[PDB]
Symmetry: C4
Subunit: 93 residues, 4 copies
């Protein structure tokens, strides 16, 4: 609970920061900026969008090193503290 | 066994859900929809396909956060509870 | 040693299998086939190459689920049993 | 501290080595060479850049197997020994 909540808030703030940056510096729509932020921090990287400016590339490097840690943390706790118990509870007939 | 079976079923259902969504909203062939779902949840992300609609992008964001946890879980148990023993058994002359 | 050797051989065989498949079914040069196999199993996925046939896509799905487990295993042991000690040994003045 | 410092230096050197290689063999700007090195070793892989020469592809294969181990190590310690405590310290009213 309290741990998953913190991680949830930290993830939300991280994605908000990305959305604001890419819509500003790279000129993306806010929706596309959020899309790029997620596709980046989860390391999926389709490359349908990518930073065209040097500022954009430099920020993204730092965004990645800082962002991956907490994003996968959230993903991990979400799966281990939320999804796991639920699946088990559904396996009791 | 019982753990790997559950994870196997959960993975199958997850991929089925993706196949139905992308063939519907993004208009992909069912085979290409399954292909995108896998390439997404394993975080490979070639970008040969990517969602063009806003609905598609929003769903994929949620699909990723929810899907990665179980997909890598399956991958992990598959390697640790199935592949590992087999390799060891083949190393006894 | 014996563990890292096994993992090394298993990785080599896996990459050889990929090289043969993609040069055959997708018609890539052997070098490009090996390149795609690695870029796939390490989950990097540039998408400079991607399978164009349905056979190619179906095989790759299976290749991914089976291959990621051992490839990251090798990567892990390589870093924990080989790179780690070496760095420490270089930190003794 | 001493552990995070070492990992920090090892990461810096790894990225420097990549920058020099890609600007030399693939003819990228130094900034784009660093960009590719990071996007590669964190496994994001946008594919906005990718090696066009066989030398480039062969080196990158080796760069990946060697580089991922330490890069994610740094990312891990950064998140567990630096980001984690800080967030907790900010949660004390
Ligand atoms: K990727
Ligand atoms: K990618
Ligand atoms: K890509
Ligand atoms: K990845």
């Amino acid at each position: 609970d309290k741990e998953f909540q913190v991680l949830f808030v930290l993830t939300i703030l991280t994605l908000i920061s990305g959305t604001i940056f890419y819509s500003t510096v790279e000129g993306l729509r806010p929706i596309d900026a959020l899309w790029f932020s997620v596709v980046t921090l989860t390391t999926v990287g389709y490359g349908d969008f990518s930073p065209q400016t040097d500022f954009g590339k430099i920020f993204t490097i730092l965004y990645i090193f800082i962002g991956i840690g907490l994003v996968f943390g959230f993903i991990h706790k979400l799966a281990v503290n939320v999804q796991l118990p639920s699946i088990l509870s559904n396996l009791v007939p």
